[PDB]
């Protein structure tokens, strides 16, 4: 009741997570590339469980509900709100699933839901009239602080995107500008563990990064928040300020982690390509043609 856990796969050795693919939310067993398939952790496969009276899973990075419906016949799915009875669950012991509603056993699948892909990851879960034996899923507690943090990444995320698009659309508020800053300034200090705080060049030196939390910047869209904001002037001193941090949060989220640097350089390409390599040469132009 109200403890948040990763569902483990036991055959399939893969977590039960939710993430949005071809612009929709989908349920999934997520293939993994490690070589310690416990090491594959998400925050998009952290689950809050809920007691009905028996239990409901919350997603916790985005707030919907693990549900099943018709496509085995049901696959599990994601839905908005935790009200029907189709995102009731029953645990049968190491535990297997029983979706009330329809009276199936969760099933695991080979069928690929990111098919364009190549080596697709993203395998479809459905529930089958028979309770299988090697169906059996691990329930695998998640600390405190990894909660505190995807809490952290999450509300950012937010605001982060907020304030960008306020930014994209013209200017913001002074207690925006601050808001922002202080909150760049914070994913410094988070993504690195304590060991810079972003406020001067000379402190680089020491900075150590901190894996789990690089990779939630990633995942829970800070650092495509972050690329948001860098565009919308393109599209004073605090300003210079906010990006000179954005930069610094980039830094530290792609130190000696190869998945973020390869993640950064593709946005910052993209950005630069949907900016327009001309822009400042048009502009020059145009406040020439103005007289200034
Ligand atoms: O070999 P490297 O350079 O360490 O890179 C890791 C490798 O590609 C893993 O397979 C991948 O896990 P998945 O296959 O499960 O994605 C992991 O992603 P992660 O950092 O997002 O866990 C990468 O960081």
Same mark, same amino acid.
């Given at each position: 009741g109200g403890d948040v856990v990763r569902l483990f796969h /036991? =055959?399939? &050795? #893969?977590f039960l997570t939710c993430d949005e693919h071809r612009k929709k939310q989908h349920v999934f067993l997520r293939t993994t590339?490690?070589? *310690? /398939?416990?090491? /594959?952790? !998400? !925050? #998009?496969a952290l689950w809050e469980v809920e007691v009905v009276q028996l239990f409901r899973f919350k997603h916790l990075a985005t707030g919907h509900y693990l549900a099943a419906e018709v496509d085995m016949v049901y696959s599990l799915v994601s839905v908005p &709100?935790?009200?029907?009875?189709? *995102?009731i669950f029953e645990l049968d012991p190491y535990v297997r699933l029983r979706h009330l509603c329809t009276n199936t056993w969760v099933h695991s699948t080979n069928?690929?839901?990111? #098919? =364009? &892909? &190549? #080596?697709?990851v993203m395998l479809k879960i459905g529930t089958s009239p028979l309770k299988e034996d090697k169906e059996a899923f691990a329930i695998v507690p998640v600390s405190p602080a990894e909660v505190r943090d995807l809490d952290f990444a999450n509300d950012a995320s937010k605001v982060l995107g907020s304030i960008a698009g306020k930014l994209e659309k013209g200017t913001i508020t002074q207690n925006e500008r601050r808001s922002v800053t202080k909150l760049l300034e914070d994913l410094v200090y988070f993504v690195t563990g304590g060991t810079n705080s972003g406020q001067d060049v000379l402190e680089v030196v020491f900075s150590k990064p901190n894996r789990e939390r690089q990779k939630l910047m990633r995942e829970q869209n800070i650092l495509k928040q972050i690329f948001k904001l860098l565009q919308a002037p393109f599209t004073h001193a605090p300003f210079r300020h906010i990006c000179r941090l954005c930069y610094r949060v980039l830094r530290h989220s792609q130190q000696d982690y190869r998945k973020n640097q390869e993640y950064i350089a593709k946005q910052f390409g993209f950005m630069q390509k949907q900016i327009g390599y001309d822009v400042l040469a048009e502009d020059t132009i145009t406040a020439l043609l103005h007289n200034n």
């Amino acid at each position: 009741g109200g403890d948040v856990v990763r569902l483990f796969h /036991a =055959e399939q &050795e #893969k977590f039960l997570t939710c993430d949005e693919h071809r612009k929709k939310q989908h349920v999934f067993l997520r293939t993994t590339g490690r070589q *310690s /398939a416990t090491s /594959a952790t !998400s !925050s #998009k496969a952290l689950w809050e469980v809920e007691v009905v009276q028996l239990f409901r899973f919350k997603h916790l990075a985005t707030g919907h509900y693990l549900a099943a419906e018709v496509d085995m016949v049901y696959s599990l799915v994601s839905v908005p &709100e935790g009200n029907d009875i189709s *995102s009731i669950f029953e645990l049968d012991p190491y535990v297997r699933l029983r979706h009330l509603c329809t009276n199936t056993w969760v099933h695991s699948t080979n069928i690929p839901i990111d #098919k =364009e &892909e &190549e #080596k697709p990851v993203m395998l479809k879960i459905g529930t089958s009239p028979l309770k299988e034996d090697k169906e059996a899923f691990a329930i695998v507690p998640v600390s405190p602080a990894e909660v505190r943090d995807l809490d952290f990444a999450n509300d950012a995320s937010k605001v982060l995107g907020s304030i960008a698009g306020k930014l994209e659309k013209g200017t913001i508020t002074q207690n925006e500008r601050r808001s922002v800053t202080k909150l760049l300034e914070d994913l410094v200090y988070f993504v690195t563990g304590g060991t810079n705080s972003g406020q001067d060049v000379l402190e680089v030196v020491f900075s150590k990064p901190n894996r789990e939390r690089q990779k939630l910047m990633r995942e829970q869209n800070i650092l495509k928040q972050i690329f948001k904001l860098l565009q919308a002037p393109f599209t004073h001193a605090p300003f210079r300020h906010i990006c000179r941090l954005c930069y610094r949060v980039l830094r530290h989220s792609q130190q000696d982690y190869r998945k973020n640097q390869e993640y950064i350089a593709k946005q910052f390409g993209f950005m630069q390509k949907q900016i327009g390599y001309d822009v400042l040469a048009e502009d020059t132009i145009t406040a020439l043609l103005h007289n200034n």
